[PDB]
Design a protein around this ligand. Structure first.
Ligand SMILES: *[C@@H]1O[C@H](CO)[C@@H](O[C@@H]2O[C@H](CO)[C@@H](O[C@@H]3O[C@H](CO[C@H]4O[C@H](CO)[C@@H](O)[C@H](O)[C@@H]4O)[C@@H](O)[C@H](O[C@H]4O[C@H](CO)[C@@H](O)[C@H](O)[C@@H]4O)[C@@H]3O)[C@H](O)[C@H]2NC(C)=O)[C@H](O)[C@H]1NC(C)=O
Ligand SMILES: *[C@@H]1O[C@H](CO[C@@H]2O[C@@H](C)[C@@H](O)[C@@H](O)[C@@H]2O)[C@@H](O[C@@H]2O[C@H](CO)[C@@H](O)[C@H](O)[C@H]2NC(C)=O)[C@H](O)[C@H]1NC(C)=O
Ligand SMILES: *[C@@H]1O[C@H](CO[C@@H]2O[C@@H](C)[C@@H](O)[C@@H](O)[C@@H]2O)[C@@H](O[C@@H]2O[C@H](CO)[C@@H](O)[C@H](O)[C@H]2NC(C)=O)[C@H](O)[C@H]1NC(C)=O
Ligand SMILES: *[C@@H]1O[C@H](CO)[C@@H](O[C@@H]2O[C@H](CO)[C@@H](O)[C@H](O)[C@H]2NC(C)=O)[C@H](O)[C@H]1NC(C)=O
Ligand SMILES: [Zn+2]
Ligand SMILES: [Zn+2]
Ligand SMILES: [Zn+2]
Ligand SMILES: [Zn+2]
Ligand SMILES: [Zn+2]
Length: 426
């Protein structure tokens, strides 16, 4: 009778779970019509290829598609303690067809959709490069869009988070359901090539200084951190020697992450609309940090592209109170199948540990996997390349040059190591 906190009953080890959704790209104009050049503004005058109620590969997301993704989550039977949402809500239309008010309108719509369906779920958003008007021009001082999302996302964020969000589009925030876990939501659009507003700035919106201080505080307060952002660090895996953010910023951000690798238990990005892994390593090739790029809900592609993604959403498993990543479950919609019969069947695509026969998502485990990808005719890599497009096309092939680009980007996030990998493997 000493009022002792009740000790857990010895049982099978519980795991925590959270959702990651990204790149919704709602197109409010979507509607089926005979003139296929009028199905969606986002096809920019192209004929929709084969449109249905859940969308088209040349179009951004019909509302019904986004709705079906969130209804799948809600009825999935999966318990989750939070969700990360890494941005990009307006669709791909020319700048003159949007405005600041319209951008805010679409972000509001996506935010309220989530809040209505998931009223008890803490959500951690990050801004995407399309979450501003004109696109990509995210500023280094406060702005209407920053002020708007600060209000929209107040239910999820504390006063501190709201203040930094309003100033620069970034924040950190303790996870109410998970003591000892902090989310750091970066505005990596400040580092994105097309952003005129940050040309020649060594530390736009002071995000690097803020990030270094935030991580140091977490290190000393014994927290763990999940980093989330829209545009990823590292190299585009389909292009040669092309960093996803400006090289100066990539190198500087990576050095921070390497220095605080003991505190960072995960990094989660979108923007590419593909399913990609990266492993941050030191200069000598030792793995330090696992990086997960998540595919988009939208299936949009340009006419010039051959492949695109199926819609996807994903879920992570972690060790409770510790926050080590245990597994990832990717879900998807076979878009063609769903448009043909008119009914969504969001379903399991793969479970990372089972697909690749790894114990967990720790850097050394993923590093060992990717050194398998490097082997000639690796069946593991073939699977990875199938999932890269979220199983859009099992006959898509990756020739020697393509695979070199993929594997080099998976393993080498900084310029010196990426270039050395090209020297050895081109
Ligand atoms: C998401 O959902 C879609 C639609 O259900 C699935 O796509 C279908 O997949 C099946 C099986 O993979 C395909 O059936 C086979 O197609 C092969 C031809 O490939 C292309 O060529 C046709 C030619 O008209 C194109 O129209 C089309 O785009 C195909 O991509 C054929 O070789 C097969 O014929 C053989 O099948 C059996 C033998 O096993 C025999 O019955 C036949 O006589 C013959 O020997 C077969 O036709 C089907 O074409 C696909 N449909 C579409 C619209 O692409 C995806 O697989 C699914 N995604 C995932 C991840 O499962
Ligand atoms: C968009 O498509 C229209 C319609 O073309 C037809 O439908 C397509 C889905 C496909 O089946 C084509 O083979 C068809 O021709 C295009 O307009 C057609 O263009 C050709 C060439 O002038 C002509 O034979 C048709 O009569 C045209 N119109 C119709 C109603 O068929 C239109 O050019 C396409 N737009 C773009 C930007 O590609
Ligand atoms: C990172 O933080 C350490 C720890 O300092 C503490 O950090 C928080 C707990 C907060 O409460 C701060 O006010 C604390 O001081 C810093 O280490 C300090 O370094 C200074 C020299 O600059 C030294 O005089 C102090 O004695 C150190 N404190 C301890 C406890 O060792 C460190 O400077 C910070 N690193 C960076 C890059 O800012
Ligand atoms: C987000 O936008 C969608 C589409 O613009 C809204 O859904 C439509 O709302 C109007 C009602 O004003 C109806 O006429 C349509 O039939 C609705 N459905 C579709 C598929 O267009 C949706 O209500 C908006 N959500 C929020 C929270 O504002
Ligand atoms: Zn996007
Ligand atoms: Zn884009
Ligand atoms: Zn983007
Ligand atoms: Zn080449
Ligand atoms: Zn280079």
């Amino acid at each position: 009778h000493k009022l002792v906190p009740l000790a857990p009953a010895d049982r099978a080890p519980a795991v925590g779970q959270f959702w990651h959704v990204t790149d919704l790209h709602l197109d409010p104009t979507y509607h089926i019509t005979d003139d296929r050049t009028k199905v969606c503004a986002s096809s920019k005058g192209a004929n929709a290829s084969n449109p249905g109620p859940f969308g088209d590969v040349l179009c951004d997301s019909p509302y019904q598609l986004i709705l079906s993704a969130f209804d799948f989550i809600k009825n999935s039977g999966q318990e989750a303690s939070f969700m990360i949402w890494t941005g990009d809500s307006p669709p791909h239309v020319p700048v003159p067809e949007l405005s600041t008010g319209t951008v805010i309108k679409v972000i509001t719509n996506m935010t309220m959709t989530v809040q209505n369906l998931f009223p008890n779920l803490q959500v951690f958003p990050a801004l995407g490069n399309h979450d501003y008007w004109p696109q990509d021009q995210l500023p280094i001082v406060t702005s209407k869009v920053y002020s708007a999302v600060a209000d929209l996302w107040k239910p999820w964020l504390g006063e501190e988070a709201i203040s930094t969000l309003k100033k620069g589009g970034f924040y950190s925030q303790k996870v109410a359901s998970n003591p000892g876990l902090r989310i750091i939501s970066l505005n990596t659009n400040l580092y994105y090539g097309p952003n005129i507003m940050t040309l020649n700035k060594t530390d736009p919106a002071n995000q690097f200084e803020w990030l270094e201080n935030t991580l140091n505080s977490s290190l000393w307060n014994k927290e763990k951190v999940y980093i989330i952002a829209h545009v990823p660090v590292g190299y585009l895996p389909y292009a040669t020697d092309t960093p996803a953010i400006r090289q100066y910023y990539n190198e500087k951000l990576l050095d921070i992450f390497r220095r605080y690798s003991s505190v960072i238990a995960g990094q989660f990005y979108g923007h590419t609309h593909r399913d990609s892994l990266m492993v941050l390593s030191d200069k000598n090739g030792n793995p330090l940090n696992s990086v997960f790029v998540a595919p988009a809900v939208t299936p949009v592609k340009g006419v010039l592209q051959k492949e695109t993604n199926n819609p996807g959403v994903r879920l992570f498993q972690y060790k409770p109170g510790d926050y080590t990543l245990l597994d990832m479950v990717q879900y998807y919609l076979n878009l063609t199948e769903a448009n043909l019969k008119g009914e969504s069947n969001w379903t399991l695509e793969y479970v990372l540990t089972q697909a690749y026969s790894v114990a967990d998502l720790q850097p050394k485990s993923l590093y060992a996997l990717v050194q398998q990808f490097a082997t000639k005719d690796s069946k593991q890599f073939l699977k990875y390349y199938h999932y890269y497009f979220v199983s859009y096309d099992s006959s898509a092939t990756c020739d020697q040059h393509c695979k070199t680009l993929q594997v080099c980007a998976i393993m080498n996030l900084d310029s010196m190591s990426y270039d050395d990998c090209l020297k050895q493997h081109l």
